[PDB]
Design a binder for this molecule. Structure first.
Ligand code: HEM
Length: 184
């Protein structure tokens, strides 16, 4: 199951966060880890297009070189708290899996900077919690978590030592497609 108490950042700035730029996941904490291990890479670009909040996701498996994209229209449940109804797409926006009722993830921006963030995400595929995931984002894929985001982790009653770093995961990102998917 998932957490639903994750508290949004007080005085969270949307304009800065949803600037249409790319966020890299430098570290994460998966409360519900799979039986089969898989060192992953992920990035996202959150922005505005056509008058709506949009988010584009990217997942990469270095080992298999497998890549998958997603694009969702966001609905604000409260500033910092969002619900995303995703659609799996080709890197050019061609839909592989349409939006579906049982399909959506929700996330909370627990802390945000000009250069870093801490989010809580809860993914549901086929209406069923798939577990809690906590991520440390950064606008730069090479920066280690700063004192501020780590304070935020602590403030949420978590342990950063429990976070896994995607640093030497041999990641590769497609920021061009990530940003362009924003309009799809
Ligand atoms: C930045 C936050 C992230 C968001 C918002 C997010 C969102 C999602 C979404 C929407 C899917 C479904 C794609 C589809 O089938 O169309 C997915 C699948 C997946 N993600 Fe993430 N994800 C994030 C971070 C990560 C990280 C860091 C890992 C590494 C632990 C991870 C591992 C996976 C795996 C293994 C799948 C497929 C599992 C399944 O289909 O149940 N994700 N993610």
């Amino acid at each position: 199951k998932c957490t639903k108490n994750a508290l949004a950042q007080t005085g969270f700035n949307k304009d800065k966060y949803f600037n249409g730029d790319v966020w890299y996941v430098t570290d994460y904490l998966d409360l519900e880890p799979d039986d089969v291990p898989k060192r992953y890479c992920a990035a996202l670009a959150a922005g505005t297009a056509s008058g709506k909040l949009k988010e584009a996701l990217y997942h990469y498996d270095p080992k298999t070189q497998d890549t998958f994209y997603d694009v969702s229209e966001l609905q604000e449940e409260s500033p910092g708290k969002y619900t995303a109804n995703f659609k799996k797409v080709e890197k050019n926006g061609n839909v592989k899996v349409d939006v579906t009722s049982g399909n959506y993830y929700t996330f909370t921006v627990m802390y945000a900077d000009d250069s870093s963030a801490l989010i809580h995400t809860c993914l549901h595929k086929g209406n069923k919690d798939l577990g809690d995931l906590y991520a440390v984002l950064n606008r730069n894929k090479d920066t280690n978590a700063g004192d501020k985001v780590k304070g935020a982790v602590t403030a949420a009653s978590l342990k950063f030592s429990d976070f896994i770093s995607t640093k030497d995961n041999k990641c590769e990102y497609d920021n061009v497609s990530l940003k362009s998917l924003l309009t799809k």
